[PDB]
Amino acid sequence: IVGGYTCGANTVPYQVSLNSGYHFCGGSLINSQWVVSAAHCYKSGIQVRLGEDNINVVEGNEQFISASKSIVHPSYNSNTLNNDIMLIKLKSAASLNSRVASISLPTSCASAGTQCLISGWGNTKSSGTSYPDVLKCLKAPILSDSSCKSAYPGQITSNMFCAGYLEGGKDSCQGDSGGPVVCSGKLQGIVSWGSGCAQKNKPGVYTKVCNYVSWIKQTIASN
Ligand SMILES: COc1ccc2[nH]cc(CCN)c2c1
Ligand SMILES: [Ca+2]
Numbered sequence: 001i002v003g004g005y006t007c008g009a010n011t012v013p014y015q016v017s018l019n020s021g022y023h024f025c026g027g028s029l030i031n032s033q034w035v036v037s038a039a040h041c042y043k044s045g046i047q048v049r050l051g052e053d054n055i056n057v058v059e060g061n062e063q064f065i066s067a068s069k070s071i072v073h074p075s076y077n078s079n080t081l082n083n084d085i086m087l088i089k090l091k092s093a094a095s096l097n098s099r100v101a102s103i104s105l106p107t108s109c110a111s112a113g114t115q116c117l118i119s120g121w122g123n124t125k126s127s128g129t130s131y132p133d134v135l136k137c138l139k140a141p142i143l144s145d146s147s148c149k150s151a152y153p154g155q156i157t158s159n160m161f162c163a164g165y166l167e168g169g170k171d172s173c174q175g176d177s178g179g180p181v182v183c184s185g186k187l188q189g190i191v192s193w194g195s196g197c198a199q200k201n202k203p204g205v206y207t208k209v210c211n212y213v214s215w216i217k218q219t220i221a222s223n
Contacts, residue, residue, distance in 0.1 A: 001176055002125065002172075007137040012180075018046050019048075023055050026122075026175075027179065029103065031102050048066070052135070054133045055121055070086060084190065115141050124136065131175060140170060148160070161208050167200065169198050
């Protein structure tokens with residue numbers, strides 16, 4: 001997260017870190033046994049880390065639970081990042097509390113202008129590299145479909161939205177991948193892609209979760 005703020009320990013209780021020996025992606029806890037992330041975060045050997053603030057220090061609220069199964073969206077296209085969503089089933093249910101909590105799926109798609117919270121442990125610079133150890137937060141609005149399509153001609157599908165600032169300076173970045181965009185207490189987006197981070201006229205692009213609720217619910221019910 002470039003141009004954000006330090007969230008504060010366990011203020012974003014649905015945020016997960018996907019760990020394969022190191023943090024490599026975020027995700028969101030949607031019930032005691034399931035995480036949603038980005039399909040581009042797929043790999044085998046995932047441990048889900050819940051209750052994290054500092055990803056390098058054991059602070060006492062963590063739960064470390066191995067993935068049993070990963071399900072990439074059947075229509076995920078790694079070239080276009082259309083359908084950039086994946087579900088991860090935990091080996092055992094998480095213990096839910098004020099610091100480890102699920103985030104509700106949306107019943108409705110959020111409109112342009114809605115303010116959202118984006119969180120992650122990604123890079124905090126738009127040029128060069130500095131990785132924070134504690135969770136960073138950014139408040140950003142959903143942009144109009146027309147602004148989003150004007151910024152990324154020929155690349156925005158109906159399964160994507162833009163959020164952020166056309167001015168630049170505030171955005172999700174490398175290592176924020178898979179993390180949540182929460183608007184009005186519902187999961188509306190997944191950190192998916194962009195052209196660099198925090199560049200002028202290049203907002204972040206997010207998976208439009210409201211289009212996937214039926215797939216999520218059906219998949220969870222049968223796995
Ligand atoms: C440094 O460039 C990258 C590299 C990989 C990335 N994944 C997701 C994003 C978000 C951009 N908002 C991103 C940016
Ligand atoms: Ca920790």
